[PDB]
Design a protein around this nucleic acid. Structure first.
Ligand code: MG
Ligand code: MG
Ligand code: MG
Ligand code: MG
Ligand code: MG
Ligand code: MG
Ligand code: MG
Ligand code: MG
Ligand code: MG
Ligand code: MG
Ligand code: MG
Ligand code: MG
Lengths: 167, 164, 99, 138, 258
RNA sequence: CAUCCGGUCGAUCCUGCCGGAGCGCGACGCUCUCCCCAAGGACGAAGCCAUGCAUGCCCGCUCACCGGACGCGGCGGACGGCUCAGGACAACGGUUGCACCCCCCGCGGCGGUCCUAGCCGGACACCGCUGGCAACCCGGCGCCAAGACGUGCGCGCAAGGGCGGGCGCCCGGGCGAGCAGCGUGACGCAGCGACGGCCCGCCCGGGCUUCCGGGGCAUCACCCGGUCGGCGCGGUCGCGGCGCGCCGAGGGCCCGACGCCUGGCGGAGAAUCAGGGUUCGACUCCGGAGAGCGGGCCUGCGAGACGGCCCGCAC
RNA sequence: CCCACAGCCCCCGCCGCGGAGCCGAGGGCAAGCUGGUGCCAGCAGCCGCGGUAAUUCCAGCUCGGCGAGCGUCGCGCGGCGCUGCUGCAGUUGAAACGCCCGUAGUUGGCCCCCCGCCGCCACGAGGAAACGGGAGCGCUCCAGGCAGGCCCGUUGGAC
RNA sequence: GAAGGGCCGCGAGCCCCCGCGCCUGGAGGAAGGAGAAGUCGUAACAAGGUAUCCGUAGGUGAACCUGCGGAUGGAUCCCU
């Protein structure tokens, strides 16, 4: 069905190449998982039998993940609230779809439970006093079944803040 | 597939490019009469063998004397010729090979070697007795007229012990 | 980039002259070689085009000599990366330069 | 000279020979393809057809026949060699027809004849000429 | 493009040094996976049938192997297609015959009868040092044998002496200039010489130059250079000390034997 | 293993072609005493097929009949065999690489598993009773087995994720090459375990990949528009315009692009014979593709399988 | 004896079928006398024969070539230096653009003794056999195959 | 967790339009070749009875004729 074979493409000069064999199962593909934030309801993850008997799992729905604050070395499990920015398309943001690189809002309860007073990075403390903290996704849902990440800081935090402020 | 497909095979003679040539016909009939040749394929076979020997000798002679390959192949060829009796013992230089003639090949046939020993009246008589298995080489009897005897086996040729 | 990026050089190292530098971070390299024809006991001059990635650390114009190293497939036609540039004077004569 | 002779000139010589080898009539006939499509035998040694009409500086009337090839459906003319062999050929009869000595061109004083009859009704014509076989089945 | 692995082997496509006859049959034995690969091994049945002549057919060899009359490094093997390789031990207790598998000058496998003093061990060439699970260092050899916790002083391309009874190292020979070696592949298989130079080319093969005892010199790549002791061989070697004769000398030998 | 001969004229010398003379591959005709070897529906019908055969074996589980049936279970059936339709920067041949990869059997190691163990639980197959149907096929009730299925006793361990080297460059687990492994902070409890094997290495095999070679026509001279490159994500065993969104514009060509044609499978090789060459290469070994045409898929380490299943079309 | 069983080869005894065809005789091209027919019938790859002796048609005799094989048709190589790199021709036989400029392409005087790179020559490593060449061996010889005798290079299957 | 249903994905078959390649009928028109012992005249080969030929333009039953410029492959290697 779906394939990633190069035999259906044109050559570097723009010519059409002939089809000299039928489709092969080495070069198959599958439909995207399109993992959805939860926001008959619960976490759902599916397993896929891949080549060689290996097992691959794609998440279809999830709500929680582990997020780490590198500067202070504070890592907790937090609930994801909603997606606010994506560098590929606004449609993914409207639908609340989770992929690697998405910028999300997580609950501040686990991180304000402690070190809300300790003199750390000021730009993060103000977020802690509120209700949500800007974060990023580092894992690949649809391949491993998890949505983990880290808390933003440095120039990238300013970049995304300026990006999503005027809206 | 069948194992029989890997067996080799080849022809053993060459036909003249110009068929009708009076001197050639005369010479071929002459040779057939002296050596009692059944047909003209034997002459072609002899010519084939002579051509092979001549080509080997040429290729070897084109090289330098102190060439390892030249020494190896010349020694092998000379040893073969001496063993088969085509070339005389006293000749050991490669040059003498190129002057050889098919008569020398013919003279070592079984009919000839038994006729020169006086054991048969004529080549035709020799062929008739050979076909009737009345001759023996060493301890074995050979019924092929074209069988070629080796120099060490010339004195061991006799009449078949069981022959009547 | 082979220096600041996440690619590794491995395999064959080649040389050639620059043919075009119009893409964002890529160029086309010209290679020249000889082909022998046994029947006529003579040669033919032939050339091939090889596309490569050019990192911003290098500045290249047409005609310069570059050294390219092999890497994993970076695109549909690119499997090489520039590693060394030797400038050549502009206005110089185009010449058949096997390398 | 009048031919290119440089050490790096193999391509020019190749193309020159490629272009100029087409001027030979025999090579064109053999490797152009028009002859293959035009030849009624379609490259075969001989073909099989059906008789449909017996017809006729040397002044010697010759006996021939019109044939219609089965596999190709086209019409040709064939000539009956031996002496008195026309009687062995009857109208509406199956024959096997081969070529003459020359491949395509006419042979001898016969105008526009390039095919030969060799077998009739499954029996060799020459054999029937010598009485080796007989046509009592027909 | 075959859908799976291959299980047959045509006789004509078999390795040359096996010396199979062209008309023996359509097929040849296909060795199973084991210590040695297809191109550097030889099936057991060939030795048991076409060399020692103890069996005349496949069935006889199978019966003998089932009766467990052959030992390979002290472990009975019942597979007629078990691959045998270089520096193996081949002992048949029921006939008090013990051999070591080696290479002849012509580049073929040979059986060298040995003594009991040296038949309880084998020499192995180390090709790889890697970290396994939990960071524990390992090493691998040409016969597909892995050892844990080896001495740090052991490096790649060295030679290792392992006792067959237990499977433990006792001593090792470093790879250096002036150490007797034996060639295990290529045009120079079966020759014995001493290393004289080591030339390494960046990003490509490393070349080893050794001189024969008579004075001959030849070259080969490091991938098939096997140290068999220091100065003098640790194990027994065939009658000829790895000296390849020329064609003329070989022809003289043939004529003498005829 | 460097050869020529007859034909334009009233006669002569040339150019130039026609024909003859040799070998090999096939078909046709006549004929044929003995022995040995030996090809054999390939030749613009990859056209259509009655009839028989071409893939089984057995350690595990016996209250069957007198232990052998049958059945569940295990391995194999993806090798072998046939053919050359398709396909012309492709397949293929030699030469690289995966620091972008997967791998059954076999060989050698390894074996610490968080929160009734004198040994756990329920089923079906065969079989008995009872039945539908022209055939092919199956239905309902009923006691019983496991090296089958499910649960699971057990000294913290699968995948993935954050942090942990430099101050011009070079001078161990390992490399040509910052590659591996480990520590620590968070998540998650995957696999093995009712006669203990998850895991690692080698091996064969496969997937893609670098460089060179890879038919004819110029009464085909300009061609391409995911076409060229960049950024991000997804999918894949895995790299990659492989797919999607955005951005910029490019790429190829008389050293012949693009297009069209082929009675186009490729090579190792075969025919011929001074030397240089010309033609062929269905067929024995290797590689590729296919099983009426076109598609889709389950099982499984491994198939886009056809002596496996589903659909449309033609029979 | 061999063979899964049967043949076949080979060996031992008794009795005993010896059978040649296909093409041609003017030249190329080796091989000549009678009777018919009369530009008819027919032969003839090419030249040519046949209209009253036909050396060529149809028959008999004789003769020639190959031979358990010979002849006919088509294709490929050779012939062919008539595709020409080695190695054609271009005043009159077929064939130098009406002339000039000019890009791509092809070709480019002489000179530095020792350095670097490209081509080149030699050697080497690495990489399937089969086929081909080739060392040795008396399947009775041969086409073939990798064997055999004994006291065997560790018998050999080298390259 | 069955039947069934919705949207997307792979994608057959059919209908419609377009283009390419190969064969093929056709009143009439016109070219070439062969055959016969046809009719009309003589254009070229001799200075062929107007020397021949080249390019271009016009005309005529047919070969062909005429004008402009050119060549000798001409019927001239020869003249203050
Ligand atoms: Mg537990
Ligand atoms: Mg269980
Ligand atoms: Mg085809
Ligand atoms: Mg095959
Ligand atoms: Mg298939
Ligand atoms: Mg299928
Ligand atoms: Mg099948
Ligand atoms: Mg003229
Ligand atoms: Mg002329
Ligand atoms: Mg006139
Ligand atoms: Mg006139
Ligand atoms: Mg005139």
């Amino acid at each position: 069905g779906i394939t990633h074979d190069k035999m259906y493409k044109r050559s570097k000069t723009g010519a059409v190449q002939g089809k000299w064999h039928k489709k092969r199962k080495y070069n198959l593909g599958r439909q995207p998982a399109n993992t959805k934030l939860i926001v008959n309801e619960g976490q759902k993850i599916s397993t896929i039998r891949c080549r060689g008997g290996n097992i691959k799992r794609r998440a279809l729905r999830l709500s929680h993940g582990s997020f780490a604050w590198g500067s202070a070395d504070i890592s907790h499990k937090a609930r994801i609230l909603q997606v606010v920015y994506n560098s590929t398309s606004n449609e993914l943001v409207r639908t609340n779809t989770l992929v690697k690189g998405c910028v999300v809002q997580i609950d501040s309860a686990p991180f304000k439970s402690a070190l809300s007073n300790d003199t750390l990075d000021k730009e993060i403390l103000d977020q802690i006093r509120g209700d949500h903290i800007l974060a990023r996704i580092s894992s690949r849902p649809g391949q491993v079944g998890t949505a983990d990440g880290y808390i933003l800081e440095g120039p990238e935090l300013l970049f995304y803040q300026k990006k999503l402020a005027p809206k | 597939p069948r194992i029989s497909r890997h067996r080799n095979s080849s022809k053993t003679y060459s036909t003249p490019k110009k068929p009708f040539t009076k001197p050639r016909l005369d010479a071929e009939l002459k040779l057939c009469g002296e050596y009692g040749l059944k047909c003209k394929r034997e002459i072609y076979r002899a010519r084939y063998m002579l051509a092979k020997i001549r080509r080997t000798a040429r290729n070897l002679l084109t090289l330098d004397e102190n060439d390892i390959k030249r020494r190896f192949e010349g020694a092998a060829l000379l040893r073969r010729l001496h063993m088969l009796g085509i070339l005389d013992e006293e000749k050991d230089q490669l040059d003498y090979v190129l002057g050889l003639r098919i008569e020398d090949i013919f003279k070592r046939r079984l009919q000839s070697v038994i006729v020169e020993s006086k054991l048969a009246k004529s080549v035709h008589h020799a062929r008739n007795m050979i076909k009737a298995r009345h001759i023996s080489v060493g301890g074995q009897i050979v019924n092929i007229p074209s069988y070629m005897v080796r120099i060490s086996n010339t004195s061991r040729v006799a009449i078949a012990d069981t022959s009547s | 980039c082979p220096f600041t990026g996440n690619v590794s050089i491995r395999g064959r190292i080649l040389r050639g002259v620059v043919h075009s530098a119009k893409m964002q971070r890529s160029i086309i390299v010209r290679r020249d070689y000889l082909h022998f024809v046994q029947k006529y006991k003579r040669y033919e001059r032939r050339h091939k085009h090889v596309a490569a990635h050019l990192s911003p650390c290098f500045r290249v114009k047409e005609g310069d000599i570059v050294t390219i190293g092999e890497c994993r497939p970076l695109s549909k036609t690119i499997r090489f990366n520039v590693i060394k540039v030797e400038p050549v004077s502009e206005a110089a004569k185009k010449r058949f330069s096997p390398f | 000279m009048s031919k290119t002779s440089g050490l790096y000139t193999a391509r020019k010589l190749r193309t020159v020979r490629r272009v100029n080898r087409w001027a030979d009539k025999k090579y064109r006939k053999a490797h152009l393809g028009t002859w293959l499509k035009a030849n009624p035998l379609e490259g075969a040694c001989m073909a099989r057809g059906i008789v449909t009409q017996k017809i006729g500086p040397n002044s010697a009337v010759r006996k021939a026949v019109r044939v219609q090839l089965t596999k190709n459906s086209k019409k040709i003319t064939a000539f009956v060699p031996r002496d008195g062999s026309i009687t062995y050929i009857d109208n509406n009869d199956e024959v096997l027809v081969a070529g003459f000595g020359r491949a395509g061109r006419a042979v001898g004083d016969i105008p526009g004849c390039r095919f030969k009859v060799i077998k009739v009704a499954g029996i060799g014509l020459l054999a029937l000429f010598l009485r080796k076989r007989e046509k009592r089945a027909r | 493009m075959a859908r799976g692995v291959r299980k047959h082997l045509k006789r004509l496509n078999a390795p040359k040094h096996w010396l199979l006859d062209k008309m023996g049959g359509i097929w040849a034995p296909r060795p199973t996976n084991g210590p040695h690969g297809l191109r550097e091994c030889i099936p057991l049945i060939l030795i048991l049938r076409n060399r020692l002549h103890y069996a005349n057919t496949y069935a006889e060899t199978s019966m003998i192997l089932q009766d467990k009359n052959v030992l390979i490094d002290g472990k009975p093997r019942t597979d007629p297609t078990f691959p045998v390789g270089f520096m193996d031990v081949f002992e048949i207790p029921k006939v008090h015959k013990t051999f070591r598998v080696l290479y002849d000058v012509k580049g073929r496998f040979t059986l060298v009868p040995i003594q009991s003093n040296e038949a309880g061990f084998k020499l192995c060439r180390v090709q790889k040092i890697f970290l396994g699970d939990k960071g524990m260092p390992y090493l691998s050899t040409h016969d597909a044998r892995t050892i844990r916790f080896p001495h740090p002083d052991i490096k790649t391309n060295d030679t290792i002496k392992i006792n067959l009874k237990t499977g433990k190292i006792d001593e090792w020979y470093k790879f250096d200039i002036g150490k007797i070696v034996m060639v295990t592949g290529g045009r120079n298989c079966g020759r014995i010489g001493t290393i004289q130079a080591i030339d390494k080319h960046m990003g490509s093969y490393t070349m080893i130059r050794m001189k024969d005892t008579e004075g001959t010199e030849f070259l080969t790549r490091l991938c098939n250079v096997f140290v068999i002791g220091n100065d003098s061989p640790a194990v027994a070697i065939p009658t000829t000390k790895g000296i390849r004769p020329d064609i003329i000398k070989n022809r003289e030998l043939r004529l003498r034997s005829i």
